[PDB]
Amino acid sequence: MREVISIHVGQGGIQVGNACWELFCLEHGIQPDGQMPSDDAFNTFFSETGAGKHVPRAVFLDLEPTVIDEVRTGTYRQLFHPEQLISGKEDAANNFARGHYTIGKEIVDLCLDRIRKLADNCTGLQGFLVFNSVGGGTGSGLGSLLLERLSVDYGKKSKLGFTIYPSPQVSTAVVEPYNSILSTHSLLEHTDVAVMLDNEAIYDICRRNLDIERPTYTNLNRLIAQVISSLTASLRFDGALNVDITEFQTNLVPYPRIHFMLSSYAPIISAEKAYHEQLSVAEITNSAFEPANMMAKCDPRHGKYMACSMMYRGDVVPKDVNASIATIKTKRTIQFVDWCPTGFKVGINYQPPTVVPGGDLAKVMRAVCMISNSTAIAEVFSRLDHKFDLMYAKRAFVHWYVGEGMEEGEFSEAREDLAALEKDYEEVGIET
Amino acid sequence: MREVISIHVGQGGIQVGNACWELFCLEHGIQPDGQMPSDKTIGGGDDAFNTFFSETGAGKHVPRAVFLDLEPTVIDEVRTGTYRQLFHPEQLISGKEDAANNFARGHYTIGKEIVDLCLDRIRKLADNCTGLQGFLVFNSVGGGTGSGLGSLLLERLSVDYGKKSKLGFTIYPSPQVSTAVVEPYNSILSTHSLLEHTDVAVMLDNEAIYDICRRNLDIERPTYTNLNRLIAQVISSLTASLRFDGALNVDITEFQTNLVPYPRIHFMLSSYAPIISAEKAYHEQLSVAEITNSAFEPANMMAKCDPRHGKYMACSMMYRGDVVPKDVNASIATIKTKRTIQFVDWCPTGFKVGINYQPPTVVPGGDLAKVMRAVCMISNSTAIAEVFSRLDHKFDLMYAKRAFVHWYVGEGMEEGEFSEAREDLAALEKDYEEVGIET
Amino acid sequence: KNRYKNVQTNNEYFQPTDLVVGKDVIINGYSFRILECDEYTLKWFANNIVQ
Amino acid sequence: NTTQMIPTYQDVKTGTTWLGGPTHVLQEQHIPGYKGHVKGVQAESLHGKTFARITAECLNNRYKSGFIVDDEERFKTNYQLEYIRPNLRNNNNRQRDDEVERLELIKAQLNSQPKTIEDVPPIDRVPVIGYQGFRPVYRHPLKQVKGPTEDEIDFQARTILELTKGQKEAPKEIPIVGYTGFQKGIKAENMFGKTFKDLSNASNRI
Amino acid sequence: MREIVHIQGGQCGNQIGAKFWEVISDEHGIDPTGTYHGDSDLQLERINVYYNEATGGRYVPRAILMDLEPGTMDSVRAGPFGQLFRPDNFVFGQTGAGNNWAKGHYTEGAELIDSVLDVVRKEAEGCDCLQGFQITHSLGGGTGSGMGTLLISKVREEYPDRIMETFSVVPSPKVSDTVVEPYNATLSVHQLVENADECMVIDNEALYDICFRTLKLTTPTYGDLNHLVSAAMSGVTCCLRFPGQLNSDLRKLAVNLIPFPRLHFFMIGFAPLTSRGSQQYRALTVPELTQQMFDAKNMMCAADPRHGRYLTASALFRGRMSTKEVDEQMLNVQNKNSSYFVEWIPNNIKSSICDIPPKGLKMAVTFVGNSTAIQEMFKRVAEQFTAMFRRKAFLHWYTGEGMDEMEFTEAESNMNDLVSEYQQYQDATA
Amino acid sequence: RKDINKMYTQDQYILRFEGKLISQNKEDNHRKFIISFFCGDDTIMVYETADKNSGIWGGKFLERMNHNNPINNKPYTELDFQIGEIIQLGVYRFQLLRADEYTHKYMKSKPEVFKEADIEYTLNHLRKFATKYKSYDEFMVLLIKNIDPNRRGVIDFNDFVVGLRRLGYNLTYQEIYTLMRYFDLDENWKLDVKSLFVALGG
């Protein structure tokens, strides 16, 4: 009787939500039509129709019809509810003002209506997950507006945002710094937990570990899906040390302002060489803390650690976990902040990770995912602040936002908020 | 629960390590793909392969060695060969540009971008071991990339791990036979680098083993791989005490406690016996006394040095087979009685003796035969200064007119780097002559 | 302009009789099909090939 | 050649000679030191393969001669010539076949469920209720399915059972990871996202 | 990996490449249609060194054919294996230089070189990690001797760390088929010594004499000479394409074969060479190969190497051999002829082994020897150049396009100083 | 004197068996043991494996050493090492439960010393037993009715051996294993009495 509801806004959000949804259905044994192959646990993510098919607890929002059309013409035509796939007509065209004040204001109504219908059915609602690429106008604007509306409606209900920030130097658009800063300002005082999932780091991981030299978006979305499964496994499977989603905001955020943290996963390996080694829990947890394996392009060696919450799934043993944590604390290249004597939260789950046939991953009996909050994440804020400043000095591209209802001084207050956030980071980073 | 980590650098190092690892797999019964056979399905006993290998949980075993090179030919070649499935794929670290016999290129230009990955793999292999005994390093000293990478890796390891023992099996160029023309330079610089950084350094001169193959194995037309097989057998004899039962066990930690009187004096040379082919091996007794006499015979010395030109400092000698302490001591008594070999006055005793029950194993297609008795000796002595003196003369002849120096100057090294190495080698020769004098 | 071997006949040199309009020919790994030939060639056939 | 041919299995098992062996009864040698022409030493310049085996090779006439060589024995490398398995005492992997079998069975189970000939449920005749798109009016509304024909379903079937202990070989052989050679056309046709393991198979298969 | 491109200019370079790539295609089993037809896996293992890939599975040259007169390339395109070359890689002028170094180096070459530099820049960017550049040209022709050297200078200006090797066919005084050979040969070598990392010199009289005395053919042809040169210069780089006991790339040869930066002109040779009627009474052995190799006559330059002392030497044995006989024989020949080796460089020999011999052969040797005997070629070319220049004859032609006699004066000073400093090490004693 | 030719000729032949230990204490009746026989000089080694999460400090139990059977006062040979036999080393008695498939291949590939593993010998044994009964056909029908009381067509090893002992004639467990393994079509130790019947006669 415990449920979580998923919001999927923006093109990247939709095509990664597809990715996570094949994984969940395959892991619960759900056929693509949603009917059972004649075989409670799935209750977290699905809701019964009375006899037979199941409805996923997801809603997809977009203004550009092509991706929703692709989903509704794909193999999962009859899985999702046909009027929870909300599609608009005119794309925001990477314009944050368009997606925040002009068009999405008339679509958030039905988004909240569908949330109302999906939530009143639920009984022990745990919280909401939200997926949105930041480098997209409609994604950022709709995500911001939905977060503000859900804060004033729901309030204390937990919301977790998996944002994919643009890479420090590799970018697809040219005006993504503006909407990135605006969206960060918007969600800073509205979301509870925000995960860093930039693309350059996952690209490097795919190149190095899986031995893929020309990967595409599908593989990235698959790995993000595996991370989601790792996070939510304890919610629907028995384990020695299970945690709820609600056991995060009391463990990984020191202060209400600091709630942006970065993830990592292990092991990631190909079918060539998964079976040539033990996959020992000690070495996988060392690979987890290996700096180059971070899911975000940030260097942990340049900053202190506040907190680390780590999930293991498989046949791990508490003796082994304790012994590895002891070695980690012994190691000198990793240092924690002074006012945090112990910073480890651990969760254990019995069910092994599931492997997708025809995919890249091999089947391994042990896996671990870390969610870490550390001082080093200030560097992305600094670099995007420089990027925004270089633009806003000469007022480039400003008209494309001014003409659609944006006030001129709106950028200045977001800049001030980012500077205040950085100064808070500096203040908390010093020892007493 | 006792392990040792092997490192090979240079194509000579790769070719010798391949010969070592074929013999180790044959010794422990490892068929090339990794399983024991597929035809035996109990096993689960007498874990000794843990000395060199590591269990994957179900099936094959992984070698505890790392390969380093900058020219990819040998790495691709071995990755294509018969042991393709054995080695873990990212253990054979290969660069793009070779150092081209330049120590400067491999020590200051292109080795720094590969040393990070090398140390990463070293850590990833060290963490699994719990009672790891020490490190072995193999390198041809007459080559630029091998010398530079070996030197800088020794530099990093001596501070990363500190007190842990490291043994270097360097292949010094022959006194008069050479393959390249600029080997004196990088040999001197590598020697200077390793002098204060290796615990034990064993000489592996090629001309001596060429003569051995010509005389004993009756091979008039040998190759490098025969020498590699001989060196591999020597390695197996050295390491067998740590993975096979014996009446008197010796560890690698029992060498820097018995073999080197002074920290500066850590270069020694070895010999092995018997060396004979089955086509004439089984005609003779192969007694322990006679094999030990052959071992101390100067023409059988595995490095091109004359032991009759200098005093002896220490001798660590080891038997494998069915030897007995009576015959051991009876042979040692004859050795000490015989006049032509003289010890230094401050060492009335200088012999360390090791015993192992496992007889040597014979490789298919090899030259050596199977014998129930074998002896391998490692001696540190003052006669080794001759090669250093002649190499110094060669280097002085080269440096008198500043020839080839611009190649090292333009790769980022300071000009006077040769001077400090020359002073170090002169000081080493002075130290050797001072130790060799009587009280 | 140089003498070329013929794969079609025991790796021998080309001969004027080998050049046959209507039938394919191989010239140094190249496949040609002769469509029409000059009436001078017609004459030289009619006066020489007839045996 | 003598090294891998002689001490045969019959001779080593319940026989006079063991692995190394005084293999002199089996065939003739020249008992080291000997002054004379052995018909093959100064011409072919044999390597390693001690003098007994040198003389044995010449005497038993396995041999090779001439200034011309043709292709196959021309192109061998010393590494494989010397380190050629263990061979002769007691008589590699079965793999590549199990995963290729996994491959055809996946495609088999895929194309075995396209719901041929109006076997789909009453729903999905028409697209989803909210579809946008075009929906042309002068067209047959219900979708028509051709589907695979029973013969191609069987096409996969005898093959996948024949790969189970059948005549067709496990195809090709490949290197593992770091092989830097051409590997036959990964660049000409992109094959961008195809799992370098499977890239090797596909590119060598063509 | 560590691949290299081919740049050829001038008629001589074009016809060298025309036979060299036929040799390479035969060695790697490539048909004239670009489709692989080999027998072993190694024929594709280092195929990326000289070949790129195209759609349809075919192979394509990484060679640029570039010239100021298009007749030569129009003739070579029709040749066997000539359809491999990219039509785009061909670049040509429409005027011609008339064997004028000045015209080929200042007026037409300067304006033409933009496109060829662009395409070479494209090819260099295309390869994963470049090894260097090889050039083949003759110093007796004005367009080659000037424009190729200007291209070399520009290439060195952009890629200072890459290795440069050039095959210079200098005009010998005996076959002088043009009278302006001294001027353009000197103007070419002046620029060549300053920027070229390394050079091999080749002599037509040397090829003629070798063919007549060793191979004993009635009517030698430029095809046979090109085949000799192609085999000889493919031998040095074969060990880069095939495994061996001791791999030795061009960078290693450069490091181990020049004591000083300015002394990078070598004399080369190939073994074995035997006539058709005499090819069967010998058996190839290491002593036979080395004794035929170190003969003065077998060298591909008319310079007599026994008139001076070898500064250093390098030998690449190719074929299935092992090291004892090779190095013992090399030590033996070094000890036997100690008078012909300068003493302060003991063990002045490099030896390397490649495992794959030439097609149709068991053993082969590629030799590169840096000796002071090459000075006499510079002596004769300088005396001929001063005989030309003292009367200022044939000089108005050069001076009519912007350059003057100061360039000639500085060039002659440079080569005389080079000769003096090169012979200085001949008499040096330790 | 030491037999050197024996060392050289049969060094590689190593026999691996699995067994269970019959001896004094009740506590140690459960753990498993692996016996190794080196025929170079007829030497025996015993190893004790420790399954995970047991608490037994498993290790090397008896070393490579050579000793003889007490009653016959003769050293053990490869003939004595048959599966299902009881061998006493010193004071410790072992029952040979299982052998390696390599060991079975060696057994079957070397006849005229290992007669009990030879299938035609075992079948001839069982058939020449039938001289006691009056007629061959009634002997066979009594045989089938006694091994299969309910006529199922497939049985277990215990049922087969108890039926044969009910018959009373003496086959050792080695011949029983030989027949039982040979007549298992899908390698799960289920006898095909129909194949046994047709093999005997039809």
Ligand SMILES: Nc1nc2c(ncn2[C@@H]2O[C@H](COP(=O)(O)OP(=O)(O)OP(=O)(O)O)[C@@H](O)[C@H]2O)c(=O)[nH]1
């Ligand atoms: N990691 C990841 N990033 C994506 C993916 N798809 C899009 N992005 C990022 O999203 C940015 C642009 O936003 P999109 O998601 O493509 O489109 P949008 O969010 O709907 O915004 P609009 O383009 O205005 O409709 C690009 O710069 C990409 O970096 C994806 O599948 N994975």
Ligand SMILES: Nc1nc2c(ncn2[C@@H]2O[C@H](COP(=O)(O)OP(=O)(O)OP(=O)(O)O)[C@@H](O)[C@H]2O)c(=O)[nH]1
């Ligand atoms: N005994 C023996 N010596 C070898 C072997 N390979 C190389 N050497 C020695 O190594 C010296 C040259 O160095 P190499 O090992 O070939 O190459 P390197 O050490 O990696 O350095 P680079 O040449 O720059 O690549 C030669 O003089 C040989 O004496 C070998 O297989 N056996």
Ligand SMILES: Nc1nc2c(ncn2[C@@H]2O[C@H](COP(=O)(O)OP(=O)(O)O)[C@@H](O)[C@H]2O)c(=O)[nH]1
């Ligand atoms: N190796 C070789 N050299 C040639 C050939 N033809 C001409 N040469 C040499 O090239 C020189 C003349 O070069 P030239 O035609 O002026 O070159 P260009 O100025 O680039 O057209 C002569 O000295 C010849 O020795 C040939 O077929 N092979």
Ligand SMILES: [Mg+2]
């Ligand atoms: Mg979009």
Ligand SMILES: [Mg+2]
């Ligand atoms: Mg090398």
